């Protein structure tokens, strides 16, 4: 591996980029300071959404997460290999921009219907 | 996803060397080598060789390692994806027999084992 | 085929973004009050953005409308605590100084420490300082404004500041060095941090700044709509030298318990003229360089005419900067003067009573000895008319920031990112 | 289902409201901006304290998370019909207001009393 | 047990300090309000620094959290019985001053090589 | 109720003249000191 640093796979492909994440992750958390204590708050809570949204998820604590929500061919007709050793992850984004808000409620409940039915699970 | 405009056709005469440019568009120039292919009058289909407009690198048949002149230039950047690059096709000691229509052919992927498969094809050039 | 979606978390995309950014500095006081922003880390962390291609344009960046107002907002902090001239809007009783008439001998009836007793003090100021009431003079603000004097404490120095981005957000640099303005920038590297930017207040000729590699570059935005000042950005430095060679004295005058207004004394020794020298040498290949890149834009046969500047304000018609704490406006016209052992000489005045942007104004206290600054011009800011003539402009401040952020551009990180694979989780 | 929204079964059997829970999770987190800036931390505070809760009590990540800790006939003598099929959860809290700290110690040491034991197991 | 309280066991030997975790992670979590809203800032942000640490090492929602990565002989060259028997955690945070960053790097990765083995796994 | 936990076993270094507490409460006055004559009049007048 090379460490390139913080964002250093940005434009490679996003096989490449998937695994250099724990770099991303680390750097991610008078009247002068009332705009510093500012950032520093807007810091913790641009970063908590993140973790909250990973946490109703099932994802709490995984840098990479699978889950059961199947792929709709609506949101990207495109081939498994012409995504992750083609296409960057900024261009990633602007393709699933749409559909970036679809997904995140059919992960939502594939954990709600996921630990409702561990608790049926363990009741016996 | 873009074009891959190519040169006229020019007809010169045996013991002359040809210049074939291959003009790009519509995407990312240094992102997928540049393969150039032809299909002459005698045999069928030859893979040429390909070259790298990011790491320079090129790799041809031992059939025309010693004929090609082959060199790119430098994408002149259009957006954070899209580019305009040039690759530039030379031989050396020509023949009637290398007489055929040539084109280039951008590369398919930018990683794993397919990466530089000649994908994304010119239009054709008619040698001598 | 068999494809689920996955979460990613920490996946290099960013978006186009703006925040609050953050000062730094490294090692008494002064105005821009770089003792409180945060140390400067001693090693600046520049991860190069391989493959990347990143968008830029200096004239919708942000980081300088933010700069340009924290620089008005450490102004007018730093005047808080500082005396308020308003006893001085007296009716002065002025005569020239023995000798062309420039700066004043004024003497008037002053409040003292105890409120029940007058002092009849004199002091000297600059015409542009003052006017007349029909001899009888009054300062120039006190029908616009009182006047606050600036604490003989704080220093004007401009001190390299550095301007980072909070948590959750990045930097980016164009390490392009022949990068105009706007476009996209092929070669493009993070950092936590921009580089030293001096805040120099400047006018027409962007001085101590940040030169150009390779080539002399210009900028503009619509550079063929002639009311769009042209920032160039010099490649080798022209040496400029100024001074206000009259020996001045400093008096202070106790105005009231604890507010001493500190006013002009006399002038020991000889009386000269405050001016500026540049190479002529030096300025003609410099001036040779920047019509260079503007036939590039206007035609490799039509005439490059230079002028001085088509009239208006003092402050945007001369050169107006500070040197050594007290404001210069020298008169540029022996520069701008060209169609396309040396020492080219500008005649400058000075001036105590200054505005800056807008409302109310500051006293600047009269600096002892002799001043002399040495500097390098390093930008321009030009203006065509509209065969093709160019005058020095600098109708706003903020272009002087620009010239210095033009490289950077804030971005905000969002790490998530959703993506298919054969990638399923148990039961 | 009915998206019945923020606090949509607050007047709902406690079995009903269960099932919407990711609602009520998604919507949990100049001299005024002073005032703003302070409900801002608090916000972020009062948010982390739940997640702290959760955390010593490895139910981090979960909205429905089961335990060890058997539940004592001393805090709530009722059957399991007469309560998820009954009251409401907003009943439930008064009921319970008086336990609710008795609770919160036990989850503590039972999620201590099980890392310690699959310390003990993954010893060999 | 005897309820040491905060910080109770901090002369204890480790082994004894090791028990009452639960305790020290309950507590660790107008121009004075300016001063009192930057230590309630600063108290989220010292928090989430070991949560984001813990979640980028698979420990997220551990108090012991066990791992893969082996204890190297140049960190400490001592056995297993004079340390949790012998010194107490002031005294073992001395001698693991310096290696302290090196094993906090050692833990990013063994974790990133952990989700990426369980993502091939799970992908047949 | 002031909760006070004793740290049996423990022995640790003070030093009253480098702490800081007193740095801070000795700014801490001053700074009140200068807070609360913000509103209270000002004898600029009795100066006669
Ligand atoms: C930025 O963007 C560019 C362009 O997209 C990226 O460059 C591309 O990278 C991919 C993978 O990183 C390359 O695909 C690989 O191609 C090699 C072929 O190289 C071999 O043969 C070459 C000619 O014979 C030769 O150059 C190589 O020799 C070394 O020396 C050169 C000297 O110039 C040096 O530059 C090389 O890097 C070599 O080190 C080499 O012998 C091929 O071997 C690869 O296949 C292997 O790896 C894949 C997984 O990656 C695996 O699946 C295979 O089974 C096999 O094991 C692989 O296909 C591509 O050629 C590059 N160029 C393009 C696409 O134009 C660059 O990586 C990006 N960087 C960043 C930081 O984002
Ligand atoms: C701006 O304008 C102010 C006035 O508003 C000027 O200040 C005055 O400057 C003049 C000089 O130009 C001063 O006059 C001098 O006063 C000295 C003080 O002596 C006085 O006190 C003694 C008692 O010890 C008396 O006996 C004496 O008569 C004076 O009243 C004198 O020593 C000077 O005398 C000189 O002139 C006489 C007559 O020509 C000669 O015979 C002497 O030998 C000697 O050379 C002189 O009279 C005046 O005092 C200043 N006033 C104030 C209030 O300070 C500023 O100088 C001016 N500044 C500029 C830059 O223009
Ligand atoms: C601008 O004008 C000011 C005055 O308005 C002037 O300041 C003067 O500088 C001289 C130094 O050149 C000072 O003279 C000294 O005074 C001290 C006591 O104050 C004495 O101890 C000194 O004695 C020796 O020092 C010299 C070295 O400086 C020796 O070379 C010499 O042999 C002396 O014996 C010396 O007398 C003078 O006091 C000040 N005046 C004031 C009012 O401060 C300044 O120099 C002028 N600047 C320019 C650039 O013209
Ligand atoms: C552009 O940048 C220039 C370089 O930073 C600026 O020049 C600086 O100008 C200031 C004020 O005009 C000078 O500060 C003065 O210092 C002298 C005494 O300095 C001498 O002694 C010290 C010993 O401590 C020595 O280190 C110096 O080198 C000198 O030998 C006094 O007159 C005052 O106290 C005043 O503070 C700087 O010294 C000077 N720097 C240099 C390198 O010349 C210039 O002002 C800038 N221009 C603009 C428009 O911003
Ligand atoms: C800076 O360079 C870029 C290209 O490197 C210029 O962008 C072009 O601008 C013209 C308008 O003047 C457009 O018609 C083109 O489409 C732009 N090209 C690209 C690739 O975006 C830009 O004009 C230059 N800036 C200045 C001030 O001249
Ligand atoms: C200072 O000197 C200037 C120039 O020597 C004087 O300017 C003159 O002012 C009078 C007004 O009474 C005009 O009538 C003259 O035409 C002006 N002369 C010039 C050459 O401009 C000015 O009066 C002097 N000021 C004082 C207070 O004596
Ligand atoms: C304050 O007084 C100044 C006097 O200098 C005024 O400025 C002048 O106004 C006259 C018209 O009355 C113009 O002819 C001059 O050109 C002005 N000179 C300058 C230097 O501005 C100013 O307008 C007055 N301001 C107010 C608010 O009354
Ligand atoms: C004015 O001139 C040059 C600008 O290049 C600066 O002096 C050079 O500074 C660079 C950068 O530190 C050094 O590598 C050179 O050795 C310097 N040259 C000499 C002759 O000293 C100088 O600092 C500039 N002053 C400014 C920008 O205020
Ligand atoms: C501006 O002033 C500086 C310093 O006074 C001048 O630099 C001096 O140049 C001479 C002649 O080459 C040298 O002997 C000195 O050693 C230089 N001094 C320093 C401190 O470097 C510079 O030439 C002046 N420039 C202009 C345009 O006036
Ligand atoms: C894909 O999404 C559309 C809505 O955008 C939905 O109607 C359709 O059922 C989905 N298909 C699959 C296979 O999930
Ligand atoms: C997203 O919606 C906009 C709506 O105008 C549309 O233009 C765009 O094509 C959509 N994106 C994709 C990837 O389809
Ligand atoms: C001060 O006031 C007196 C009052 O009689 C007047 O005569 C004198 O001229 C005034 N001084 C000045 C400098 O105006
Ligand atoms: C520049 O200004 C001219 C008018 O001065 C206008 O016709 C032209 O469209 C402008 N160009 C751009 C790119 O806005
Ligand atoms: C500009 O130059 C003209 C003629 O050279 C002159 O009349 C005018 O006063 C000058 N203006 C400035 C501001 O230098
Ligand atoms: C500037 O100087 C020129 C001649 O050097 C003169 O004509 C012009 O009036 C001056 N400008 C000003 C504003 O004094
Ligand atoms: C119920 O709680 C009481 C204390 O309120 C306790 O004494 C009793 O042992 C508990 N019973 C059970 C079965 O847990
Ligand atoms: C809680 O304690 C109070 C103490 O006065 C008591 O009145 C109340 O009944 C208790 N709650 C329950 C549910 O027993
Ligand atoms: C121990 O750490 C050193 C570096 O400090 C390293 O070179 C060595 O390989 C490590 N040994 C083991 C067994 O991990
Ligand atoms: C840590 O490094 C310092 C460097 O001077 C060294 O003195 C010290 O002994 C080291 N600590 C250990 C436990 O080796």
Sequence with gaps: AVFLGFLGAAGSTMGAASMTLTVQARNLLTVWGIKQLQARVLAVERYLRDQQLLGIWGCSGKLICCTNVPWNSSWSNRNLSEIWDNMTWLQWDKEISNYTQIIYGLLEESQNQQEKNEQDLLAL | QGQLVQSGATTTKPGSSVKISCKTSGYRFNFYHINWIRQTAGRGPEWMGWISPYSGDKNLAPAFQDRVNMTTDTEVPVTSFTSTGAAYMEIRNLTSDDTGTYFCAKGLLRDGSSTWLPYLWGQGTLLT | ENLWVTVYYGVPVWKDAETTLFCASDAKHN?????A?????????????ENVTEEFNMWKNNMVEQMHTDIISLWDQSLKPCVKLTP??????????????????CSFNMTTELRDKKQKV???????????????????????????????????????????????????????KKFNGTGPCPSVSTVQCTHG?????????????????????????????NAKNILVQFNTPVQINCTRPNNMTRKSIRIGPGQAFYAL????????????????????????????????????????????????????????????????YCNTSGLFNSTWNDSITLPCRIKQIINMWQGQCMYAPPIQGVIRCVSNITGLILTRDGTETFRPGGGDMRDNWRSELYKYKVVKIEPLGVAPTRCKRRV
């Design chain 3, 197 to 225: 930017i001096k805040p120099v207040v400047s006018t027409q000729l962007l001085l101590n700044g940040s030169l150009a590699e390779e080539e002399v570059m210009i900028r503009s935005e619509n550079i063929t709509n």
């Design chain 3, 122 to 176: 004199y002091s000297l100021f600059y015409r542009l300082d003052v006017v007349q009431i029909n001899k009888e003079y009054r300062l120039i603000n006190c029908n616009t404004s009182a006047c606050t004097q600036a604490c003989p404490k704080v220093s004007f120095e401009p001190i390299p500041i550095h301007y980072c981005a909070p948590a959750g957000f990045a930097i980016l640099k164009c390490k392009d």
């Design chain 3, 31 to 35: 105005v821009w009050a770089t003792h």
């Design chain 3, 37 to 49: 922003c945060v140390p400067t880390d001693p090693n600046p962390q520049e991860i190069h953005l």
């Design chain 3, 88 to 105: 001085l809007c007296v009716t002065l009783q002025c005569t020239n100084v023995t000798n062309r008439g420039e700066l004043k001998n």
């Design chain 3, 265 to 328: 004394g006399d002038i020991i020794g000889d009386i000269r003229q405050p001016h500026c020298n540049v190479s002529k040498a030096t300025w003609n290949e410099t001036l040779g360089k920047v019509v260079k890149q503007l036939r590039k834009h206007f035609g490799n046969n039509t005439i490059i005419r230079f002028a001085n500047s088509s009239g208006g304000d003092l402050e945007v018609t001369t050169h107006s900067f500070n040197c050594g704490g007290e404001f210069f």
